[PDB]
A paper describes a structure:
At the first branching point in this pathway lies farnesyl pyrophosphate synthase (FPPS).
Human FPPS was crystalized in the presence of FPP, and its X-ray structure was determined at 1.9 Å resolution (Rwork/Rfree=0.172/0.211). Binding of the product at the previously speculated allosteric pocket was unambiguous based on the electron density and anomalous signals. Essentially, the conformational change expands the allosteric pocket and reshapes its surface for better steric complementarity with the long hydrocarbon tail of FPP. With FPP bound in the allosteric pocket, the enzyme adopts the open conformational state. Therefore, allosterically bound FPP can be considered as a molecular wedge that prohibits this conformational transition via steric hindrance.
Residue numbers in the entry:
A (entry chain F), B (entry chain F): 10 to 30, 36 to 252, 258 to 349
The structure:
Amino acid sequence: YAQEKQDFVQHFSQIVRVLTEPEIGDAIARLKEVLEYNAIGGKYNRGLTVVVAFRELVEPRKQDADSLQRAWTVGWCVELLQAFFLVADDIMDSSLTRRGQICWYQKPGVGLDAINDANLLEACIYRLLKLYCREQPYYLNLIELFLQSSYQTEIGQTLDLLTAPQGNVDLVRFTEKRYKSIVKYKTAFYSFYLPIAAAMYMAGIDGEKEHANAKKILLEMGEFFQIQDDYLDLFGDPIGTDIQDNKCSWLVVQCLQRATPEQYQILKENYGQKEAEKVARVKALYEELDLPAVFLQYEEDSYSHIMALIEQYAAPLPPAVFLGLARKIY
Amino acid sequence: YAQEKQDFVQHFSQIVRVLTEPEIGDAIARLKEVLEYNAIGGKYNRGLTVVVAFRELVEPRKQDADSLQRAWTVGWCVELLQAFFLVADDIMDSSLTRRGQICWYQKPGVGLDAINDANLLEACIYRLLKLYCREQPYYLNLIELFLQSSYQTEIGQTLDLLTAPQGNVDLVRFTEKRYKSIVKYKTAFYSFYLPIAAAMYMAGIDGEKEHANAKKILLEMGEFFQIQDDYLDLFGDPIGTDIQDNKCSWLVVQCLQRATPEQYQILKENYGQKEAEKVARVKALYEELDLPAVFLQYEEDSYSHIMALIEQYAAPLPPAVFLGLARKIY
Ligand SMILES: CC(C)=CCC/C(C)=C/CC/C(C)=C/COP(=O)(O)OP(=O)(O)O
Ligand SMILES: CC(C)=CCC/C(C)=C/CC/C(C)=C/COP(=O)(O)OP(=O)(O)O
């Protein structure tokens, strides 16, 4: 999809144009700057998912120019939701950089003003829905989908913040039931359920049971995507900081299920600190418990399980919708 | 309305209950805390407006228990929107206190986490709309009304932030066309248009022309409410800090229209600073230009104008809807 990703991206100037059309001129200027700095520069996978899935779902003799345009406007709505989250998350986490660039809030002259910038980005989603989809039968379903996605993601954030407060290592918090809960709400619902559900709605597939079937496949994919993401944070080939941030990682979760009382202390003494040698130490405790090996077995079991879910729950959607995602994430 | 305000407030425990009903339990706990600390302790005028206006608008033989409950749930949605804004605004402004209590973000252990708390408060609006109004014909109109209110308010904030950046006195920015624009977007739309429009929708009054008529009265009221609020910041009987915050106040606007080149300097040298004697100095420049006298004339002219607007635009709504607001604000 390098092709499909250049076409989706090229549609961005038109989204910006339509959103940034007297004395509020200067505010609309600042909105343009917020959009440009923060909705561009990622890999665009969530929004492209909308477009690809829409094409695979719709009767080919219903894809006219205006349909296709709605599909990429909705893909862009997914990207705007992402941008809202990241901008706000980066403030909350005190991050320095995003997508290799200075975080928006770290720019001179922006600072905490970025909280309202982030709100504007969210508000843009509903402005585009109304401009392009208000007369469509699925309008209200998409508004409700984006609202619900936002809520789930926010709840997930809350849970994450309570579980892993920076500067307070408390490993009793990092249970597997907690980890899974974080991932489902903070990440899997918006990343995986949102984009395909949207495409579904747009294709006229509005039934509760179908949505639920697809959700079942898609939240399981999101679980694997994040677990993988956690693994690679520490063992991928590029550097990552989950351990120097007291994160509720799949790794520390696994480590904690397999530690003796002695190891549990090595972790209690070394998790969630800045010094390289003590982060060095946890990575070495991880390799001692054969965590990469546990990951590899997990990834195999996970992949068979997803194929089973696709076999039981894809119908009557084309399996290819779910297979394409599996192929990208695995 | 001390009576009506005790009944509206008593409905709060039920709103909290319905919103805070396994492993996300701890997040839902934190949501409860956010709701309790931040949606209570104000004067509740925006949400009560919903309820009062709904009663004055609806056929009396349509106010059954479930109607009334929707009306106060929507009044509470207005209060939640307010709470979202204030929480986020207080972070942005670096404020210490709100409604005489420590600002939420200033509590130990909260800090910037409050950005996600504020998002949750906003998200609560749409959860209550869906729980109580999803089967009503006005459901989508209310979702769109709250979304649009949010956008207008955010745009207003952006404009305010650009116009009055803390630590940068630039009086060339404080024009009357700019002041009016700030007030319309940041304050008047959500405070005055939102609550009556909502009540209108709920009463079955969905027509564009009627909404526009009412908007005309209501945005003019909001202009007077804020102008008054600016005046009283400095001359009310309690202390206020617009001048020590470089605010785009109605006062500095008026002062600037009436200053000679010499006075303009007194202002350029003394506006937007912390030292009591230099704030002392601006207040004295204001009293030299007879700004309280300009305010008094403004308040009289404004009041006649609002009565004229009510006479030309209230119909077919009961004038009493608009008169009640006028009586509270004047
Ligand atoms: C339906 C179909 C056949 C689609 C085509 C395949 C496709 C575009 C899959 C994308 C899947 C996705 C949302 C991955 C998130 O990864 P990311 O690495 O972008 O995550 P990050 O943003 O968190 O880095
Ligand atoms: C329709 C009708 C007949 C209603 C009854 C009258 C009524 C409740 C009017 C309230 C008007 C209002 C929203 C004032 C905001 O002032 P505030 O001082 O609460 O503003 P602040 O929150 O910014 O201090």
